[PDB]
Paper text:
The DXO/Rai1 family of proteins consists of mammalian DXO and fungal Rai1 and Dxo1. DXO enzymes are capable of removing the entire cap structure by hydrolyzing the phosphodiester linkage between the first and second encoded nucleotides, releasing GpppN from unmethylated capped RNA (GpppN-RNA), and they can release the intact NAD+ from NAD+-capped RNA. A single active site is used for all the DXO/Rai1 hydrolytic activities, which are mediated by binding of the scissile phosphate to two divalent cations (magnesium or manganese) that are coordinated by conserved acidic residues. The eukaryotic DXO/Rai1 decapping enzymes can eliminate diverse 5′ modifications from RNA, and here we show two additional activities for them: release of FAD and dpCoA caps from RNA (deFADding and deCoAping).
A structure with strong electron density for FADP (but not FAD) was finally obtained, at 1.6 Å resolution, by soaking the compound into crystals of the E192S/E234Q/E253Q triple mutant of mDXO. Glu234 and Glu253 are direct ligands to the metal ions in the active site, while Glu192 is hydrogen-bonded to a water molecule on each metal ion. FADP is situated in the active site of DXO and is in a folded conformation, such that its adenine base and flavin are π-stacked to each other, at a distance of ∼3.5 Å. The N3 atom of adenine is hydrogen-bonded to the side-chain hydroxyl of Tyr189, and the N1 atom is close to the side chain of Glu97, which is in an ion pair with Arg177. The carbonyl oxygen on C4 of flavin is hydrogen-bonded to the side chain of Arg95 and that on C2 to the side chain of E234Q. The N1 atom of flavin is hydrogen-bonded to a hydroxyl of the ribitol group, which is situated above and contacts the generally conserved Trp131 side chain.
Numbering used by the authors: 27 to 384
Write the structure that this text describes.
Amino acid sequence: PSLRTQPSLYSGPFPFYRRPSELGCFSLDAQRQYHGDARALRYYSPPPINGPGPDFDLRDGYPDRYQPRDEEVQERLDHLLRWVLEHRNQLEGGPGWLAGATVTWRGHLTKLLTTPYERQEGWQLAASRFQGTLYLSEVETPAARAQRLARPPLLRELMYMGYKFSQYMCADKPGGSPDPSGEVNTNVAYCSVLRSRLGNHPLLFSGQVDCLNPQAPCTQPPSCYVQLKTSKEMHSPGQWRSFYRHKLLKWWAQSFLPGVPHVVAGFRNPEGFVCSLKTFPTMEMFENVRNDREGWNPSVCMNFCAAFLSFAQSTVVQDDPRLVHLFSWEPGGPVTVSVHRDAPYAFLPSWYVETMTQ
Ligand SMILES: Cc1cc2nc3c(=O)[nH]c(=O)nc-3n(C[C@H](O)[C@H](O)[C@H](O)COP(=O)(O)OP(=O)(O)OC[C@H]3O[C@@H](n4cnc5c(N)ncnc54)[C@H](O)[C@@H]3OP(=O)(O)O)c2cc1C
């Protein structure tokens, strides 16, 4: 029993995808402590329209003002489960809504969406059904762990530069001014909790949101959110084409799911300065590849993801939070399934299971 991933199998009409609704949010502070509020949300504050163009030094502060979170601390779904546990009797959708839902991180859904086009990096997703609800939690592959531990200094600094860009673009208060003089502490995060549905599969998922734009005409989340990105400056049409084909696919997938309507990109030069800014509306990203023989097709992304959810739902018959069906995928093959009990794959914690059962 396996699931093929080739684009040609999934190029029919765009499937049903429910307009996402924000159910709530949560924040992680500088000590990685959870707070069920928006204290970590910051506010879009781009360079003033009359002043100079951007010239953001994305290396400033690296590494002495860098407090990276410990990537060896395993969190899986725990922060999302805390939100669900604390809102389980306040959830919209009527009686039994959660029981028919699939609960996961937005980023896990993104990797599903990009699978038909992914040539380099495989994935593993652990699945457990508990009180009807299907939980999906990513598992770091052996190869991914090796690459992480061997991360080159350049990529460590590049990751810093991505976080640093937000500090130049965002303020702590609406209408405030960015203050890049502080630390980059990657324990800090703001997460939106969203309800959607793909095909016949209701979804509850959380996703990190970079900022809210107080100048946006629509103030209702997620319509007011902006995602921030950096990417190399491009000079030739061929470079733009490669960017549309490969980078925009992942940017589109990531912001389409939570209904974030704009991605603002800072283009950085080889010396690590952002000297150009461009806004990419999410609903217009596909226009750059629509008549492109080597482009991507949002319908393929969503139809494959729907097929995976149907496959996972039919595969995971047993309701048991200690049982895991591990879905494994590598470029050039189908998604395959193996079954495991308890450690190390089981990921629903007793504090969640015991509260929900009582
Ligand atoms: C071994 C391991 C270490 C991880 N360490 C982190 C971490 O230190 N911080 C974190 O936020 N998530 C980390 N994750 C991923 C989390 O488990 C979880 O999937 C994610 O944080 C859920 O938030 P989403 O918004 O759904 O994640 P996504 O939509 O995938 O990405 C949103 C943002 O998360 C950051 N991020 C996502 N994945 C990673 C990663 N593998 N390593 C470092 N940063 C990442 C990054 O800022 C990214 O922005 P950008 O896309 O511009 O690069 C790690 C996963 C594994 C397997």
